[PDB]
Design a protein around this ligand. Structure first.
Ligand SMILES: C[C@@H](C(=O)N1CCOCC1)N1CC[C@H](NS(=O)(=O)c2cc3cc(Cl)ccc3s2)C1=O
Ligand SMILES: [Ca+2]
Lengths: 234, 51
């Protein structure tokens, strides 16, 4: 996350971090239930073998709420394509169930029509993660969150050098220096409604981080609600 | 009008059925007596920051 603030105690409890062999974060995730994590399909081509970490806010110490989980089944969308990042979505089934507590809890799944007319027409969404702090920096040791305005579909297409499919949306800023970034991928885009937080996207791609004239691109979760429901059943 | 007038007064999901607002809630919540509010059924319900 370029810009934004730290997540304070209890504020981003649905964050999940995908970790490689070196206990090193390379992608984010969203806790959907005691057994399921939502992430980006393109994250699965970034580590031979990985685990899932939840309950963590500072990777440089133990605050006592941390929990690591092994993955039993990886469920990747079959229509996912490396060439455009279309259908960039996957669910992970965990070997052991997540025990909810301070800093560990799920985000809610919305229903499609209500989310598209009521959530997605809200001024902003919220993206969070342990990714780079600026295009050329290192990853954050602190979990961060950032408020990102929804971006008109038409402008987003004009601004983009790459194709924006019906399965994607745009958020972020035209010029201001705040955006998601490298390492935040597969992470949560949630929208707040009456003190309740609903999943609205997954961090997918961008032409750098916070570049003038470019927006952040996210997987349109609302197009995938039936697919998520199926995957969560086997 | 209806779901477009302040969310139909619903806490969560709003749906129109024949000139009438119908409220509902995400999984883990049950609809309140007044057919509008969503009540958490157990601890650590989805979408809530932990305290
Ligand atoms: C243009 C795009 C890309 O590689 N594409 C090829 C596949 O199809 C989609 C575009 N791209 C360039 C580098 C960038 N990688 S990145 O640095 O990890 C990155 C992801 C990302 C996500 C969001 Cl939401 C904002 C900024 C960034 S910064 C990225 O995805
Ligand atoms: Ca820690």
């Amino acid at each position: 996350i370029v810009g934004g603030q730290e997540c304070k105690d209890g504020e981003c409890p649905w964050q999940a971090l995908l970790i490689n062999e070196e206990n090193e974060g390379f992608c984010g995730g969203t806790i959907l239930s005691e057994f399921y994590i939502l992430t980006a399909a393109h994250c699965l081509y970034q580590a031979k073998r990985f685990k899932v970490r939840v309950g963590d806010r500072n990777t440089e110490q133990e605050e006592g709420g941390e929990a690591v989980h092994e993955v039993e089944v990886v469920i990747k969308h079959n229509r996912f394509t490396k060439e455009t990042y279309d259908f960039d979505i996957a669910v992970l089934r965990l070997k052991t169930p997540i025990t909810f507590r301070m800093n560990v809890a799920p985000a809610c799944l919305p229903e499609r029509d209500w989310a598209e007319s009521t959530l997605m027409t809200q001024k902003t969404g919220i993206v969070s993660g342990f990714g780079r702090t600026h295009e050329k920096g290192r990853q954050s040791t602190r979990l961060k969150m950032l408020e990102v305005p929804y971006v008109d579909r038409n402008s987003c297409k004009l601004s983009s050098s790459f194709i924006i499919t019906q399965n994607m949306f745009c958020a972020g800023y035209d010029t201001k220096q705040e955006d998601a970034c490298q390492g935040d991928s597969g992470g949560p885009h949630v929208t707040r409604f009456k003190d309740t937080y609903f999943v609205t996207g997954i961090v997918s791609w961008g032409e750098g981080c916070a570049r003038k004239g470019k927006y952040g691109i996210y997987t349109k979760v609302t197009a995938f609600l039936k697919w998520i429901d199926r995957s969560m059943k086997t | 009008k209806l779901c477009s007038l302040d969310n139909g007064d619903c806490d969560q999901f709003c749906h129109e059925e024949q000139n009438s607002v119908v409220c509902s809630c995400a999984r883990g919540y049950t609809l309140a007596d007044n057919g509008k509010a969503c009540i958490p059924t157990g601890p650590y319900p989805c979408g809530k920051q932990t305290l």
